[PDB]
Design a protein that fits this description.
This is part of a larger assembly, with 2 copies of chain A.
Chain A: H1 8-17, H2 32-41, H3 46-55, H4 65-69, H5 85-90, H6 100-118, H7 125-135, E1 140-144, E2 150-155, E3 170-173, H8 177-185, H9 187-203, H10 208-225, H11 231-245, E4 260-263, E5 266-269, E6 276-278, H12 302-314, H13 318-329, E7 342-345, H14 352-363, H15 374-377, E8 398-401, E9 408-409, H16 415-419, E10 425-427, E11 433-435, E12 441-444, E13 450-451, E14 464-467, E15 471-472, E16 483-484, H17 488-492, H18 498-517, H19 529-540, H20 544-551, H21 562-569, H22 586-589
Parallel strand pairs in A: 7-12, 7-14, 8-12, 9-13, 15-16
Antiparallel strand pairs in A: 1-2, 2-3, 4-5, 5-6, 10-11
The structure holds phosphoaminophosphonic acid-adenylate ester and magnesium ion (MG).
Amino acid sequence: SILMLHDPEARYLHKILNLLPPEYYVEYPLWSNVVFALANTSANYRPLAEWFSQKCPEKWNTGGKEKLEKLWNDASHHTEKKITKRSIMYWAHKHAPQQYKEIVEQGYFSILAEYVYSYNGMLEHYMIAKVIYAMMGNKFVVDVDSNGKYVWFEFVLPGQPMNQGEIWKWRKEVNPDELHIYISENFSRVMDRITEHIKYHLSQPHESNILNYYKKLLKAFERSKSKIFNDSFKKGVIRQAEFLFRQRSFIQTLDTNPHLLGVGNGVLSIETIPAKLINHFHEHPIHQYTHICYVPFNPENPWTKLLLNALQDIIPELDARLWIMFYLSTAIFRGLKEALMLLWLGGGCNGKTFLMRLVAMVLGDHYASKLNISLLTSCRETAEKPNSAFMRLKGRGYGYFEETNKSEVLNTSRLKEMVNPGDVTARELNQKQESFQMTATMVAASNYNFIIDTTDHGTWRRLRHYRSKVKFCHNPDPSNPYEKKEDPRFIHEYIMDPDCQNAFFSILVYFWEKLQKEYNGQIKKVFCPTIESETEAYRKSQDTLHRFITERVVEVYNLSEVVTAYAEWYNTNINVKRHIALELSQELENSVLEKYLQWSP
Amino acid sequence: KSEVLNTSRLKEMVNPGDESFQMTATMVAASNYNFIIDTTDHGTWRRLRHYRSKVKFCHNPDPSNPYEKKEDPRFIHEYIMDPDCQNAFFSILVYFWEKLQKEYNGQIKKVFCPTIESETEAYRKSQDT
Ligand SMILES: Nc1ncnc2c1ncn2[C@@H]1O[C@H](COP(=O)(O)OP(=O)(O)NP(=O)(O)O)[C@@H](O)[C@H]1O
Ligand SMILES: [Mg+2]
């Protein structure tokens, strides 16, 4: 009340909070959240925080000063993720209609009347922009992009035309059409209020010059009233309001929190266990989304049983099934992950494409996409205008590769450009140079083997492998438990079906929360004898020197002709490669070949 | 893999001469494999310094060897994105810059580190074909 004279917006907030039909505050538990909203949002209101506490129906006034005792102690509070006054704006708006609305138009009319009175009934772009920003300031936001071009974002609400599944989220608009419709529809009511106010004053008894002044004002306002609908005037008003709606540091703070997923029925939160769905008002800056509705995991659903049976069919090994599901569970999380990546091959009709594609299109194009094999096949790095395919992983958490023409040797150098959870820079199509954040669960499956071509620690630790065990053929001959019939309905349909995708998403989130509760969070804790044994068998293979030791080494010599024997060991039987390893390769010289123990030239 | 020096633009990079641009940066290279140098002239060998790391991190520390220690996954998986750790490291770096500024004048070819010269001379004894 000391600062009551200043900031009529304080009066506006007071009248807004006066329309709380039930006892909203109760006590500070379950309601301190709103208190924090006021505290953090109402910064300048350090004394008005205590003043509102005094006004709180269950507080110091009712002897409940201990309720705020845990609330004014953190006066500065060093605020974390912030609640906004728009949250306060939301209730007493969608909880107690009228009254609140009436004071809202009262404030609008006050501002517009002040502007009209000050400048003798002449209206320009900036005045309308101020009124509009004070009139719809909680639904639109403007921020300059990387290319130096401003963009418009609008919060979506139920009951209005929209694309499918973009509810409770922020949409990008090249032009705020709804803003034009609004300024051409709702603002005319305020202008009519101004006109009737002028008429009411005109009807009152006054001196002759007062009536002449009011007649001149009415004529000027009538002249200026039709300007609110002209195209150029509206465009200029939008251009002026552009500056008012600008909010610094918005685009770079969009879709940054990896614990929130944009789904078709709101936003999915995985901060706690169990994961909760926010299908109501919020304030998180979420723009990217997938069109998959989220439902709690339930095995009783027929599609869930069908999918579980399908996973059993594809992966006979229970431990391999569990490990694969746990690894795929990390696709939803868009944060930093352990440096793991696997491959798995097999014969035709194995079922790779079904599972990989289903995961890819259930995570959505925004969070997952298919990437070309040449992105890592090509060892040559791009200098200017890097790969736009290399830019497909921006924000994406999943990517799969199915393209191999016979055996292929990978770079083993650009792997750490994609496996290390660190940073890497890439320049987009004709816009600017930027940097990445390596957060993506990548997979690669196709026929034929992969040539690692190297024997080093690291890349070997940061890699896994698997092989198929079931084949589908139209001849399901008996005595072959690994041979099963085909279900072309699985690939041609059953994927475009939304219900199957929803069931798979439920299974995936259940597996993610299972990996969350047990094994802590790390993935290098689950025990899988099959996968580890297969990976160490792949370790034994592709290591030519080890096979040479195993079968050629029995029970001058200082690499003078040992290098020639090595270049004949594998570079003759198999075409030929440049074997530059020599005494320079002291690890090879001191490998198991050193069992001769001949350290003498 | 092991890499061979090519004595191309090694002189250009080190040289402080002024498209064209200056090089007001500190350049360093490291690898797990020995480098190969073909040139012999004193022009390149008048500069450059070699060193060999001794301690190696192994989660299974073999006895009778102080070069085993252990792998700290928390040093890489985290402790890097921490603002506080970066602030402390920056403070240490500026403190060491001040240390180099107050003593030994400012030039770096004034502090005596006999280990580094001995190791560089030993390395130059190697690669002498
Ligand atoms: N559990 C299952 N039971 C029966 N049929 C299935 C099952 N899963 C997939 N199929 C079918 O098996 C066929 C194999 O599909 P697909 O994934 O394209 O084979 P693929 O091995 O992954 N690709 P490719 O290796 O090049 O032949 C499709 O017709 C699927 O509908
Ligand atoms: Mg397939």
